[PDB]
Amino acid sequence: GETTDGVYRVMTRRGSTQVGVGVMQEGVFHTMWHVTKGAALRSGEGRLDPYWGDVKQDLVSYCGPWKLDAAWDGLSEVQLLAVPPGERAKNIQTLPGIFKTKDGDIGAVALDYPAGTSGSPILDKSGRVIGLYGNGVVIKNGSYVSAITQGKR
Amino acid sequence: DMYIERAGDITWEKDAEVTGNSPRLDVALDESGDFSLV
């Protein structure tokens, strides 16, 4: 239904709960897999059918292929456009940490917002989405660090 | 059922709160998409 680009809350009905967040871009809804787990979505009247998904990337798109291809430059600060449950969309600026894997380095933001913020877009200074928030690790005590998870066009 | 609601534009804001450090971690990604400290 709602075709418009922008950030979206993904909601569920038992009452109602926000389980995650997503990005609509060029007619495709991008979110993280663990949020929807490949379940179809309702956009008002219409329905969004799953198009592509990958558990290892923890990503899933609807109505079309993955459209987000921008990446962190490994230097500049980014902004988490966090959409917390019951809260207005807000931009949190931060300098990304680094996930050092055997297959290369991944940008990582040391921000810890509620589970319903999963899938919130991470933006560069141009306003382009360089990744989604909600998949990472835990250091010490409650200190969650999320990778900047991006797919491929 | 699961449904979506628009929450705003995709926009960089100048009045952004700034927080968080920049940790460098050795991590591994397994088949299930789970990260783990190395």
mmCIF file of all heavy atoms in Angstrom, chain A residues 13-68, unseen atoms left out:
data_model
loop_
_atom_site.group_PDB
_atom_site.id
_atom_site.type_symbol
_atom_site.label_atom_id
_atom_site.label_comp_id
_atom_site.label_asym_id
_atom_site.label_seq_id
_atom_site.Cartn_x
_atom_site.Cartn_y
_atom_site.Cartn_z
ATOM 1 N N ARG A 13 0.437 -7.978 15.896
ATOM 2 C CA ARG A 13 -0.788 -8.008 16.683
ATOM 3 C C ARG A 13 -0.954 -9.358 17.370
ATOM 4 O O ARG A 13 -0.909 -10.404 16.722
ATOM 5 C CB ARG A 13 -2.002 -7.711 15.800
ATOM 6 N N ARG A 14 -1.143 -9.328 18.685
ATOM 7 C CA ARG A 14 -1.322 -10.549 19.462
ATOM 8 C C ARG A 14 -2.755 -11.060 19.369
ATOM 9 O O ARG A 14 -3.400 -10.942 18.328
ATOM 10 C CB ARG A 14 -0.945 -10.311 20.926
ATOM 11 N N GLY A 15 -3.255 -7.117 21.885
ATOM 12 C CA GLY A 15 -2.546 -5.852 21.819
ATOM 13 C C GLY A 15 -1.651 -5.746 20.599
ATOM 14 O O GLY A 15 -1.705 -6.585 19.699
ATOM 15 N N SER A 16 -0.822 -4.707 20.568
ATOM 16 C CA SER A 16 0.088 -4.485 19.453
ATOM 17 C C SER A 16 1.505 -4.218 19.952
ATOM 18 O O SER A 16 1.702 -3.593 20.997
ATOM 19 C CB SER A 16 -0.396 -3.322 18.584
ATOM 20 O OG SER A 16 0.259 -3.317 17.328
ATOM 21 N N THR A 17 2.490 -4.691 19.194
ATOM 22 C CA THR A 17 3.889 -4.580 19.588
ATOM 23 C C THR A 17 4.773 -4.220 18.392
ATOM 24 O O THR A 17 4.524 -4.667 17.273
ATOM 25 C CB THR A 17 4.389 -5.900 20.218
ATOM 26 O OG1 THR A 17 3.490 -6.308 21.255
ATOM 27 C CG2 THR A 17 5.785 -5.737 20.799
ATOM 28 N N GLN A 18 5.793 -3.398 18.629
ATOM 29 C CA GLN A 18 6.792 -3.117 17.602
ATOM 30 C C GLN A 18 7.958 -4.091 17.729
ATOM 31 O O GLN A 18 8.682 -4.079 18.726
ATOM 32 C CB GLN A 18 7.295 -1.675 17.695
ATOM 33 C CG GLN A 18 8.399 -1.359 16.694
ATOM 34 C CD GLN A 18 8.725 0.120 16.607
ATOM 35 O OE1 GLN A 18 7.850 0.972 16.749
ATOM 36 N NE2 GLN A 18 9.992 0.430 16.369
ATOM 37 N N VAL A 19 8.134 -4.933 16.716
ATOM 38 C CA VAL A 19 9.167 -5.960 16.742
ATOM 39 C C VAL A 19 10.424 -5.537 15.987
ATOM 40 O O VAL A 19 11.486 -6.138 16.155
ATOM 41 C CB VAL A 19 8.645 -7.283 16.151
ATOM 42 C CG1 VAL A 19 7.762 -7.997 17.160
ATOM 43 C CG2 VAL A 19 7.883 -7.020 14.864
ATOM 44 N N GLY A 20 10.307 -4.502 15.161
ATOM 45 C CA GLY A 20 11.454 -4.026 14.410
ATOM 46 C C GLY A 20 11.184 -2.800 13.562
ATOM 47 O O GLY A 20 10.137 -2.162 13.675
ATOM 48 N N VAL A 21 12.145 -2.476 12.703
ATOM 49 C CA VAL A 21 12.096 -1.283 11.865
ATOM 50 C C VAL A 21 12.600 -1.647 10.464
ATOM 51 O O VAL A 21 13.352 -2.607 10.310
ATOM 52 C CB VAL A 21 12.944 -0.137 12.481
ATOM 53 C CG1 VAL A 21 12.965 1.083 11.589
ATOM 54 C CG2 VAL A 21 12.415 0.242 13.858
ATOM 55 N N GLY A 22 12.172 -0.911 9.443
ATOM 56 C CA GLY A 22 12.619 -1.191 8.092
ATOM 57 C C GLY A 22 12.763 0.034 7.213
ATOM 58 O O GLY A 22 12.386 1.138 7.601
ATOM 59 N N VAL A 23 13.306 -0.169 6.018
ATOM 60 C CA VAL A 23 13.511 0.919 5.067
ATOM 61 C C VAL A 23 12.818 0.640 3.741
ATOM 62 O O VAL A 23 13.054 -0.390 3.110
ATOM 63 C CB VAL A 23 15.006 1.156 4.795
ATOM 64 C CG1 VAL A 23 15.192 2.259 3.757
ATOM 65 C CG2 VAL A 23 15.726 1.500 6.080
ATOM 66 N N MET A 24 11.961 1.564 3.322
ATOM 67 C CA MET A 24 11.357 1.496 2.001
ATOM 68 C C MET A 24 12.166 2.355 1.035
ATOM 69 O O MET A 24 12.330 3.556 1.251
ATOM 70 C CB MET A 24 9.903 1.963 2.043
ATOM 71 C CG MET A 24 9.114 1.667 0.781
ATOM 72 S SD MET A 24 8.423 0.002 0.774
ATOM 73 C CE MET A 24 7.184 0.141 2.058
ATOM 74 N N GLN A 25 12.687 1.735 -0.019
ATOM 75 C CA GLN A 25 13.442 2.467 -1.030
ATOM 76 C C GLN A 25 13.240 1.848 -2.404
ATOM 77 O O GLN A 25 13.485 0.657 -2.595
ATOM 78 C CB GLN A 25 14.931 2.507 -0.682
ATOM 79 C CG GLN A 25 15.783 3.230 -1.716
ATOM 80 C CD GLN A 25 17.105 3.707 -1.153
ATOM 81 O OE1 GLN A 25 17.243 3.905 0.053
ATOM 82 N NE2 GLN A 25 18.083 3.898 -2.026
ATOM 83 N N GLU A 26 12.796 2.670 -3.350
ATOM 84 C CA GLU A 26 12.510 2.234 -4.716
ATOM 85 C C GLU A 26 11.546 1.048 -4.743
ATOM 86 O O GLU A 26 11.768 0.066 -5.449
ATOM 87 C CB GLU A 26 13.812 1.899 -5.452
ATOM 88 C CG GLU A 26 14.442 3.105 -6.147
ATOM 89 C CD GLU A 26 15.955 3.014 -6.245
ATOM 90 O OE1 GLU A 26 16.531 2.020 -5.755
ATOM 91 O OE2 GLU A 26 16.569 3.945 -6.810
ATOM 92 N N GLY A 27 10.477 1.153 -3.961
ATOM 93 C CA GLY A 27 9.417 0.161 -3.967
ATOM 94 C C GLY A 27 9.742 -1.126 -3.235
ATOM 95 O O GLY A 27 8.966 -2.078 -3.283
ATOM 96 N N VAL A 28 10.884 -1.157 -2.556
ATOM 97 C CA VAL A 28 11.312 -2.353 -1.841
ATOM 98 C C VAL A 28 11.461 -2.071 -0.349
ATOM 99 O O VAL A 28 12.073 -1.080 0.043
ATOM 100 C CB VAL A 28 12.642 -2.888 -2.398
ATOM 101 C CG1 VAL A 28 13.144 -4.063 -1.569
ATOM 102 C CG2 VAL A 28 12.466 -3.290 -3.846
ATOM 103 N N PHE A 29 10.888 -2.940 0.477
ATOM 104 C CA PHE A 29 11.002 -2.791 1.920
ATOM 105 C C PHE A 29 12.135 -3.648 2.468
ATOM 106 O O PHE A 29 12.095 -4.875 2.380
ATOM 107 C CB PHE A 29 9.688 -3.151 2.610
ATOM 108 C CG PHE A 29 9.678 -2.845 4.079
ATOM 109 C CD1 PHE A 29 9.669 -1.536 4.526
ATOM 110 C CD2 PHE A 29 9.677 -3.867 5.015
ATOM 111 C CE1 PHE A 29 9.661 -1.249 5.874
ATOM 112 C CE2 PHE A 29 9.668 -3.584 6.366
ATOM 113 C CZ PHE A 29 9.658 -2.275 6.794
ATOM 114 N N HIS A 30 13.144 -2.993 3.031
ATOM 115 C CA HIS A 30 14.309 -3.679 3.567
ATOM 116 C C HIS A 30 14.251 -3.728 5.087
ATOM 117 O O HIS A 30 14.060 -2.705 5.736
ATOM 118 C CB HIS A 30 15.600 -2.984 3.131
ATOM 119 C CG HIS A 30 15.631 -2.602 1.681
ATOM 120 N ND1 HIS A 30 14.828 -1.620 1.153
ATOM 121 C CD2 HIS A 30 16.389 -3.065 0.658
ATOM 122 C CE1 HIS A 30 15.080 -1.495 -0.141
ATOM 123 N NE2 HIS A 30 16.022 -2.358 -0.463
ATOM 124 N N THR A 31 14.422 -4.919 5.647
ATOM 125 C CA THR A 31 14.557 -5.062 7.090
ATOM 126 C C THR A 31 15.497 -6.225 7.394
ATOM 127 O O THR A 31 16.044 -6.841 6.482
ATOM 128 C CB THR A 31 13.195 -5.281 7.780
ATOM 129 O OG1 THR A 31 13.379 -5.357 9.196
ATOM 130 C CG2 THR A 31 12.539 -6.560 7.286
ATOM 131 N N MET A 32 15.695 -6.515 8.674
ATOM 132 C CA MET A 32 16.545 -7.627 9.070
ATOM 133 C C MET A 32 15.719 -8.902 9.208
ATOM 134 O O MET A 32 14.558 -8.857 9.619
ATOM 135 C CB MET A 32 17.277 -7.313 10.375
ATOM 136 C CG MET A 32 17.997 -5.977 10.359
ATOM 137 S SD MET A 32 19.412 -5.928 11.473
ATOM 138 C CE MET A 32 20.567 -6.974 10.594
ATOM 139 N N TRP A 33 16.323 -10.035 8.857
ATOM 140 C CA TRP A 33 15.613 -11.308 8.819
ATOM 141 C C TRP A 33 15.022 -11.696 10.171
ATOM 142 O O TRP A 33 13.870 -12.107 10.245
ATOM 143 C CB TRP A 33 16.539 -12.425 8.328
ATOM 144 C CG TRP A 33 15.888 -13.784 8.317
ATOM 145 C CD1 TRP A 33 15.882 -14.701 9.331
ATOM 146 C CD2 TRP A 33 15.145 -14.373 7.243
ATOM 147 N NE1 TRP A 33 15.185 -15.823 8.951
ATOM 148 C CE2 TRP A 33 14.723 -15.646 7.673
ATOM 149 C CE3 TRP A 33 14.798 -13.948 5.957
ATOM 150 C CZ2 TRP A 33 13.970 -16.493 6.866
ATOM 151 C CZ3 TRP A 33 14.050 -14.794 5.157
ATOM 152 C CH2 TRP A 33 13.645 -16.050 5.615
ATOM 153 N N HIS A 34 15.803 -11.558 11.238
ATOM 154 C CA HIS A 34 15.361 -12.000 12.560
ATOM 155 C C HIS A 34 14.154 -11.211 13.065
ATOM 156 O O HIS A 34 13.507 -11.611 14.032
ATOM 157 C CB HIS A 34 16.505 -11.902 13.572
ATOM 158 C CG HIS A 34 16.850 -10.502 13.971
ATOM 159 N ND1 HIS A 34 17.833 -9.768 13.342
ATOM 160 C CD2 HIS A 34 16.353 -9.704 14.944
ATOM 161 C CE1 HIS A 34 17.923 -8.578 13.906
ATOM 162 N NE2 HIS A 34 17.033 -8.512 14.880
ATOM 163 N N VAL A 35 13.856 -10.096 12.408
ATOM 164 C CA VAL A 35 12.691 -9.296 12.749
ATOM 165 C C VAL A 35 11.409 -9.946 12.235
ATOM 166 O O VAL A 35 10.461 -10.150 12.994
ATOM 167 C CB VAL A 35 12.807 -7.872 12.181
ATOM 168 C CG1 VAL A 35 11.491 -7.135 12.332
ATOM 169 C CG2 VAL A 35 13.933 -7.116 12.869
ATOM 170 N N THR A 36 11.394 -10.284 10.949
ATOM 171 C CA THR A 36 10.205 -10.843 10.309
ATOM 172 C C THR A 36 10.295 -12.353 10.102
ATOM 173 O O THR A 36 9.270 -13.040 10.086
ATOM 174 C CB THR A 36 9.940 -10.181 8.945
ATOM 175 O OG1 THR A 36 10.977 -10.540 8.026
ATOM 176 C CG2 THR A 36 9.895 -8.663 9.087
ATOM 177 N N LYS A 37 11.518 -12.854 9.937
ATOM 178 C CA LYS A 37 11.779 -14.271 9.690
ATOM 179 C C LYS A 37 11.098 -14.759 8.415
ATOM 180 O O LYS A 37 10.704 -15.920 8.310
ATOM 181 C CB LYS A 37 11.347 -15.119 10.890
ATOM 182 C CG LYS A 37 12.097 -14.789 12.170
ATOM 183 C CD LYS A 37 11.712 -15.715 13.313
ATOM 184 C CE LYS A 37 12.533 -15.401 14.562
ATOM 185 N NZ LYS A 37 12.221 -16.322 15.694
ATOM 186 N N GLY A 38 10.976 -13.862 7.442
ATOM 187 C CA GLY A 38 10.422 -14.210 6.147
ATOM 188 C C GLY A 38 8.910 -14.138 6.081
ATOM 189 O O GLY A 38 8.311 -14.573 5.101
ATOM 190 N N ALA A 39 8.290 -13.587 7.118
ATOM 191 C CA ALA A 39 6.839 -13.454 7.139
ATOM 192 C C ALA A 39 6.393 -12.305 6.245
ATOM 193 O O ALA A 39 7.053 -11.268 6.177
ATOM 194 C CB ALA A 39 6.343 -13.246 8.561
ATOM 195 N N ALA A 40 5.274 -12.496 5.554
ATOM 196 C CA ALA A 40 4.707 -11.444 4.724
ATOM 197 C C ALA A 40 4.244 -10.287 5.597
ATOM 198 O O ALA A 40 3.911 -10.473 6.769
ATOM 199 C CB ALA A 40 3.554 -11.981 3.889
ATOM 200 N N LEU A 41 4.228 -9.089 5.025
ATOM 201 C CA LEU A 41 3.829 -7.900 5.763
ATOM 202 C C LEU A 41 2.574 -7.275 5.172
ATOM 203 O O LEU A 41 2.273 -7.449 3.991
ATOM 204 C CB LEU A 41 4.961 -6.869 5.777
ATOM 205 C CG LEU A 41 6.264 -7.284 6.457
ATOM 206 C CD1 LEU A 41 7.376 -6.338 6.065
ATOM 207 C CD2 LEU A 41 6.094 -7.319 7.966
ATOM 208 N N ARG A 42 1.849 -6.544 6.012
ATOM 209 C CA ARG A 42 0.691 -5.780 5.572
ATOM 210 C C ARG A 42 1.047 -4.301 5.500
ATOM 211 O O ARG A 42 1.579 -3.737 6.451
ATOM 212 C CB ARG A 42 -0.493 -5.998 6.515
ATOM 213 N N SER A 43 0.769 -3.680 4.361
ATOM 214 C CA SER A 43 0.988 -2.250 4.201
ATOM 215 C C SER A 43 -0.355 -1.570 3.980
ATOM 216 O O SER A 43 -0.708 -1.226 2.855
ATOM 217 C CB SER A 43 1.940 -1.970 3.035
ATOM 218 O OG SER A 43 2.268 -0.593 2.960
ATOM 219 N N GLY A 44 -1.104 -1.381 5.061
ATOM 220 C CA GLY A 44 -2.456 -0.865 4.956
ATOM 221 C C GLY A 44 -3.371 -1.913 4.357
ATOM 222 O O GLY A 44 -3.648 -2.936 4.983
ATOM 223 N N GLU A 45 -3.833 -1.669 3.136
ATOM 224 C CA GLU A 45 -4.701 -2.618 2.448
ATOM 225 C C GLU A 45 -3.900 -3.727 1.772
ATOM 226 O O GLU A 45 -4.236 -4.906 1.886
ATOM 227 C CB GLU A 45 -5.569 -1.899 1.413
ATOM 228 N N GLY A 46 -2.840 -3.339 1.070
ATOM 229 C CA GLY A 46 -2.049 -4.278 0.296
ATOM 230 C C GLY A 46 -1.189 -5.197 1.142
ATOM 231 O O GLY A 46 -1.221 -5.145 2.371
ATOM 232 N N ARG A 47 -0.418 -6.047 0.474
ATOM 233 C CA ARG A 47 0.464 -6.983 1.159
ATOM 234 C C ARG A 47 1.852 -6.976 0.535
ATOM 235 O O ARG A 47 1.993 -6.899 -0.686
ATOM 236 C CB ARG A 47 -0.117 -8.398 1.122
ATOM 237 C CG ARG A 47 0.718 -9.427 1.866
ATOM 238 C CD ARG A 47 0.227 -10.840 1.612
ATOM 239 N NE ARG A 47 0.511 -11.284 0.250
ATOM 240 C CZ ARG A 47 -0.412 -11.480 -0.685
ATOM 241 N NH1 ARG A 47 -1.694 -11.278 -0.411
ATOM 242 N NH2 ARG A 47 -0.053 -11.885 -1.895
ATOM 243 N N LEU A 48 2.874 -7.049 1.382
ATOM 244 C CA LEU A 48 4.250 -7.138 0.914
ATOM 245 C C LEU A 48 4.742 -8.575 1.004
ATOM 246 O O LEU A 48 4.904 -9.117 2.097
ATOM 247 C CB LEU A 48 5.166 -6.221 1.728
ATOM 248 C CG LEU A 48 4.784 -4.747 1.886
ATOM 249 C CD1 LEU A 48 5.984 -3.948 2.371
ATOM 250 C CD2 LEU A 48 4.234 -4.166 0.593
ATOM 251 N N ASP A 49 4.973 -9.195 -0.144
ATOM 252 C CA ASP A 49 5.457 -10.569 -0.168
ATOM 253 C C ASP A 49 6.978 -10.600 -0.152
ATOM 254 O O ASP A 49 7.625 -9.777 -0.798
ATOM 255 C CB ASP A 49 4.923 -11.304 -1.395
ATOM 256 C CG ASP A 49 3.421 -11.513 -1.338
ATOM 257 O OD1 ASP A 49 2.927 -11.983 -0.291
ATOM 258 O OD2 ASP A 49 2.736 -11.198 -2.336
ATOM 259 N N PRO A 50 7.555 -11.550 0.600
ATOM 260 C CA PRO A 50 9.012 -11.688 0.667
ATOM 261 C C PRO A 50 9.603 -11.940 -0.714
ATOM 262 O O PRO A 50 9.021 -12.679 -1.505
ATOM 263 C CB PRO A 50 9.211 -12.898 1.584
ATOM 264 C CG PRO A 50 7.942 -13.003 2.361
ATOM 265 C CD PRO A 50 6.866 -12.548 1.433
ATOM 266 N N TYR A 51 10.741 -11.316 -0.999
ATOM 267 C CA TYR A 51 11.377 -11.459 -2.300
ATOM 268 C C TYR A 51 12.746 -12.120 -2.180
ATOM 269 O O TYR A 51 13.062 -13.046 -2.926
ATOM 270 C CB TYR A 51 11.512 -10.098 -2.982
ATOM 271 C CG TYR A 51 12.009 -10.171 -4.409
ATOM 272 C CD1 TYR A 51 11.118 -10.237 -5.472
ATOM 273 C CD2 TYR A 51 13.370 -10.173 -4.695
ATOM 274 C CE1 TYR A 51 11.569 -10.301 -6.777
ATOM 275 C CE2 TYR A 51 13.827 -10.239 -5.996
ATOM 276 C CZ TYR A 51 12.924 -10.303 -7.030
ATOM 277 O OH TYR A 51 13.382 -10.368 -8.321
ATOM 278 N N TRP A 52 13.557 -11.628 -1.250
ATOM 279 C CA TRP A 52 14.883 -12.188 -1.019
ATOM 280 C C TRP A 52 15.218 -12.196 0.465
ATOM 281 O O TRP A 52 14.815 -11.301 1.206
ATOM 282 C CB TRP A 52 15.946 -11.404 -1.795
ATOM 283 C CG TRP A 52 17.347 -11.743 -1.385
ATOM 284 C CD1 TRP A 52 18.127 -12.748 -1.882
ATOM 285 C CD2 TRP A 52 18.132 -11.084 -0.384
ATOM 286 N NE1 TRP A 52 19.349 -12.750 -1.257
ATOM 287 C CE2 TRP A 52 19.378 -11.740 -0.332
ATOM 288 C CE3 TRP A 52 17.903 -10.000 0.468
ATOM 289 C CZ2 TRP A 52 20.391 -11.349 0.541
ATOM 290 C CZ3 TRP A 52 18.910 -9.613 1.337
ATOM 291 C CH2 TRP A 52 20.139 -10.287 1.364
ATOM 292 N N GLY A 53 15.956 -13.213 0.896
ATOM 293 C CA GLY A 53 16.361 -13.319 2.283
ATOM 294 C C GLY A 53 17.617 -14.146 2.463
ATOM 295 O O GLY A 53 17.930 -15.006 1.643
ATOM 296 N N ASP A 54 18.342 -13.877 3.542
ATOM 297 C CA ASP A 54 19.547 -14.626 3.868
ATOM 298 C C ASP A 54 19.797 -14.555 5.367
ATOM 299 O O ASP A 54 20.011 -13.472 5.915
ATOM 300 C CB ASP A 54 20.751 -14.086 3.098
ATOM 301 C CG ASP A 54 21.945 -15.016 3.162
ATOM 302 O OD1 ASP A 54 22.532 -15.162 4.254
ATOM 303 O OD2 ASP A 54 22.298 -15.601 2.118
ATOM 304 N N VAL A 55 19.767 -15.710 6.024
ATOM 305 C CA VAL A 55 19.910 -15.780 7.474
ATOM 306 C C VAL A 55 21.302 -15.350 7.940
ATOM 307 O O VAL A 55 21.438 -14.684 8.969
ATOM 308 C CB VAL A 55 19.592 -17.204 7.986
ATOM 309 C CG1 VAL A 55 20.196 -17.450 9.362
ATOM 310 C CG2 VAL A 55 18.087 -17.426 8.015
ATOM 311 N N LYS A 56 22.332 -15.705 7.178
ATOM 312 C CA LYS A 56 23.698 -15.345 7.550
ATOM 313 C C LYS A 56 23.907 -13.832 7.506
ATOM 314 O O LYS A 56 24.555 -13.264 8.384
ATOM 315 C CB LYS A 56 24.716 -16.044 6.648
ATOM 316 C CG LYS A 56 26.159 -15.695 6.984
ATOM 317 C CD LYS A 56 27.134 -16.724 6.436
ATOM 318 C CE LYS A 56 28.556 -16.435 6.895
ATOM 319 N NZ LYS A 56 29.499 -17.550 6.589
ATOM 320 N N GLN A 57 23.358 -13.181 6.487
ATOM 321 C CA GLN A 57 23.414 -11.727 6.410
ATOM 322 C C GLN A 57 22.381 -11.107 7.339
ATOM 323 O O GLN A 57 22.455 -9.919 7.649
ATOM 324 C CB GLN A 57 23.185 -11.243 4.979
ATOM 325 C CG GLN A 57 24.207 -11.738 3.974
ATOM 326 C CD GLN A 57 23.918 -11.245 2.572
ATOM 327 O OE1 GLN A 57 23.250 -10.230 2.389
ATOM 328 N NE2 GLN A 57 24.414 -11.966 1.575
ATOM 329 N N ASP A 58 21.428 -11.925 7.780
ATOM 330 C CA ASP A 58 20.312 -11.473 8.604
ATOM 331 C C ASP A 58 19.568 -10.347 7.897
ATOM 332 O O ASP A 58 19.255 -9.320 8.497
ATOM 333 C CB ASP A 58 20.792 -11.017 9.986
ATOM 334 C CG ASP A 58 19.655 -10.883 10.985
ATOM 335 O OD1 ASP A 58 18.729 -11.719 10.950
ATOM 336 O OD2 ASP A 58 19.687 -9.940 11.805
ATOM 337 N N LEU A 59 19.303 -10.542 6.611
ATOM 338 C CA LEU A 59 18.611 -9.537 5.819
ATOM 339 C C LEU A 59 17.459 -10.144 5.034
ATOM 340 O O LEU A 59 17.448 -11.340 4.745
ATOM 341 C CB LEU A 59 19.580 -8.839 4.867
ATOM 342 C CG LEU A 59 20.639 -7.951 5.521
ATOM 343 C CD1 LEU A 59 21.565 -7.375 4.465
ATOM 344 C CD2 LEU A 59 19.991 -6.844 6.341
ATOM 345 N N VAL A 60 16.490 -9.300 4.698
ATOM 346 C CA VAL A 60 15.335 -9.718 3.919
ATOM 347 C C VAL A 60 14.706 -8.502 3.254
ATOM 348 O O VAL A 60 14.618 -7.432 3.857
ATOM 349 C CB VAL A 60 14.290 -10.454 4.791
ATOM 350 C CG1 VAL A 60 13.922 -9.625 6.006
ATOM 351 C CG2 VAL A 60 13.050 -10.796 3.979
ATOM 352 N N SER A 61 14.292 -8.663 2.001
ATOM 353 C CA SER A 61 13.636 -7.586 1.277
ATOM 354 C C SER A 61 12.269 -8.027 0.774
ATOM 355 O O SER A 61 12.000 -9.219 0.644
ATOM 356 C CB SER A 61 14.501 -7.118 0.106
ATOM 357 O OG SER A 61 14.646 -8.144 -0.856
ATOM 358 N N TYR A 62 11.408 -7.057 0.497
ATOM 359 C CA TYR A 62 10.056 -7.341 0.042
ATOM 360 C C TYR A 62 9.753 -6.628 -1.270
ATOM 361 O O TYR A 62 10.284 -5.548 -1.532
ATOM 362 C CB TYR A 62 9.042 -6.930 1.108
ATOM 363 C CG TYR A 62 9.081 -7.784 2.354
ATOM 364 C CD1 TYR A 62 10.087 -7.622 3.297
ATOM 365 C CD2 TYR A 62 8.104 -8.739 2.596
ATOM 366 C CE1 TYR A 62 10.126 -8.395 4.435
ATOM 367 C CE2 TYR A 62 8.134 -9.517 3.734
ATOM 368 C CZ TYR A 62 9.147 -9.339 4.650
ATOM 369 O OH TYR A 62 9.183 -10.112 5.786
ATOM 370 N N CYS A 63 8.913 -7.256 -2.091
ATOM 371 C CA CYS A 63 8.430 -6.703 -3.363
ATOM 372 C C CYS A 63 9.514 -6.529 -4.425
ATOM 373 O O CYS A 63 9.213 -6.154 -5.557
ATOM 374 C CB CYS A 63 7.731 -5.360 -3.135
ATOM 375 S SG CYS A 63 6.442 -5.415 -1.885
ATOM 376 N N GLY A 64 10.765 -6.803 -4.073
ATOM 377 C CA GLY A 64 11.860 -6.642 -5.010
ATOM 378 C C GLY A 64 13.212 -6.925 -4.388
ATOM 379 O O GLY A 64 13.308 -7.192 -3.187
ATOM 380 N N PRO A 65 14.272 -6.874 -5.204
ATOM 381 C CA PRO A 65 15.638 -7.161 -4.754
ATOM 382 C C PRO A 65 16.181 -6.093 -3.808
ATOM 383 O O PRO A 65 15.619 -5.004 -3.714
ATOM 384 C CB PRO A 65 16.437 -7.189 -6.059
ATOM 385 C CG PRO A 65 15.660 -6.315 -6.986
ATOM 386 C CD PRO A 65 14.220 -6.538 -6.636
ATOM 387 N N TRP A 66 17.267 -6.422 -3.114
ATOM 388 C CA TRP A 66 17.906 -5.500 -2.180
ATOM 389 C C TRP A 66 18.445 -4.274 -2.914
ATOM 390 O O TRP A 66 19.226 -4.398 -3.858
ATOM 391 C CB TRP A 66 19.028 -6.214 -1.420
ATOM 392 C CG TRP A 66 19.571 -5.437 -0.261
ATOM 393 C CD1 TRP A 66 20.655 -4.613 -0.263
ATOM 394 C CD2 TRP A 66 19.050 -5.410 1.075
ATOM 395 N NE1 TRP A 66 20.843 -4.071 0.985
ATOM 396 C CE2 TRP A 66 19.871 -4.545 1.826
ATOM 397 C CE3 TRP A 66 17.969 -6.030 1.708
ATOM 398 C CZ2 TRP A 66 19.647 -4.287 3.175
ATOM 399 C CZ3 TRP A 66 17.748 -5.773 3.048
ATOM 400 C CH2 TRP A 66 18.583 -4.909 3.767
ATOM 401 N N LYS A 67 18.023 -3.091 -2.473
ATOM 402 C CA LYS A 67 18.306 -1.848 -3.188
ATOM 403 C C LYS A 67 19.383 -0.990 -2.523
ATOM 404 O O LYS A 67 19.914 -0.069 -3.145
ATOM 405 C CB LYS A 67 17.023 -1.021 -3.336
ATOM 406 C CG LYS A 67 15.883 -1.735 -4.055
ATOM 407 C CD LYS A 67 16.186 -1.932 -5.532
ATOM 408 C CE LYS A 67 14.985 -2.498 -6.271
ATOM 409 N NZ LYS A 67 15.248 -2.659 -7.726
ATOM 410 N N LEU A 68 19.703 -1.284 -1.267
ATOM 411 C CA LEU A 68 20.666 -0.475 -0.524
ATOM 412 C C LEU A 68 22.096 -0.962 -0.755
ATOM 413 O O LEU A 68 22.428 -2.103 -0.433
ATOM 414 C CB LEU A 68 20.335 -0.495 0.971
ATOM 415 C CG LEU A 68 18.855 -0.347 1.338
ATOM 416 C CD1 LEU A 68 18.660 -0.368 2.847
ATOM 417 C CD2 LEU A 68 18.256 0.915 0.734
#
